[PDB]
Swiss-Prot record, chain B:
PROSITE patterns for the chain: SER_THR_PHOSPHATASE (PS00125)
Record text on cofactor binding: Binds 2 manganese ions per subunit.
Binding site for Mn(2+) 1: 58, 60, 86
Organism: Oryctolagus cuniculus (Rabbit)
Keyword Cell division: yes
Matches recorded under InterPro entries: Calcineurin-like_PHP_ApaH, Metallo-depent_PP-like, PP1_catalytic_subunit, Ser/Thr-sp_prot-phosphatase, STPPase_N
Listed name of the protein: Serine/threonine-protein phosphatase PP1-alpha catalytic subunit
Location of Phosphoserine modifications: 16
PTM comment, free text: Phosphorylated.
A Pfam family annotated for this UniProt entry: STPPase_N
Reaction(s) catalysed (UniProt annotation): O-phospho-L-seryl-[protein] + H2O = L-seryl-[protein] + phosphate; O-phospho-L-threonyl-[protein] + H2O = L-threonyl-[protein] + phosphate
Role summary: Protein phosphatase that associates with over 200 regulatory proteins to form highly specific holoenzymes which dephosphorylate hundreds of biological targets. Protein phosphatase 1 (PP1) is essential for cell division, transcription elongation, and participates in the regulation of glycogen metabolism, muscle contractility and protein synthesis. Involved in regulation of ionic conductances and long-term synaptic plasticity. May play an important role in dephosphorylating substrates such as the postsynaptic density-associated Ca(2+)/calmodulin dependent protein kinase II.
Binding-site residues for Mn(2+) 2, renumbered to this chain: 58, 86, 118, 167, 242
Amino acid sequence: XLXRXXX
Amino acid sequence: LNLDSIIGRLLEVQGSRPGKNVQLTENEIRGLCLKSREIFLSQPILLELEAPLKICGDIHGQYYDLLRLFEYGGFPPESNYLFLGDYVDRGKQSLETICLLLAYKIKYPENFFLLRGNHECASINRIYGFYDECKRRYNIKLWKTFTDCFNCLPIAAIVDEKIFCCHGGLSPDLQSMEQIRRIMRPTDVPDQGLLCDLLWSDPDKDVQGWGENDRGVSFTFGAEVVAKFLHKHDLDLICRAHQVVEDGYEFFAKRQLVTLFSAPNYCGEFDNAGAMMSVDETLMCSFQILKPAD
Ligand SMILES: [Mn+2]
Ligand SMILES: [Mn+2]
């Protein structure tokens, strides 16, 4: 969920 | 290049307090980059390795966790190591992280190995942190030095002809291992192709064959693809990283593939563990895990 480039 | 001095200073903060910086000189960092770059170009792009050894997944600047990993697996040269990439970005200490790894590569070039991850690429660095860390603590020229070094990192490794290791995953363009060997360095990661896929692809339980990757680049592949690959190449396992997995490690396709993520407490959606895989002489696997902060 961090940003899908990727949590 | 005073390697031993650099290593001592890097290790010096062990136990001091999570977050304490180790500020090497730019000349020292430049030296780590130039000497390791030389070694990378000197060794195969497709590494042929021997077990036993320890394999680590993504670190992402979590220096203090890298230190916990070495403490658990044994600081070089107490054990052989193969890191699968993604040393920088996201974390607070990408500089100390990449510097210690480059230092150990130079120190033990035949017993320490580093593969290229999708984050060891200039464009991604600008967005995910490494560029800003370098600009703040050093200068932009040093960041370029790092990228030139990154552009020479090996892309894959095969442990005792049975375990195929890479950062991302398989490629629909991967017919022969010689294709990988043909990849010339220095090189940046392209938007498409074999090299791109090896650093970007992901396995997908829900995919039949090859599929589109939600990352906006590369592909996703199914268990059948894996099974077919191993069979065709007479391999036993595919060891990769790239994806955050809650237990630090996760098997795929009836244990024909394993994902390793070594940076604990990285994910926002969940408290993930960080795992390091020990591969013994008979290619059996066991794990040493950094469980989430209880
Ligand atoms: Mn990655
Ligand atoms: Mn990663």
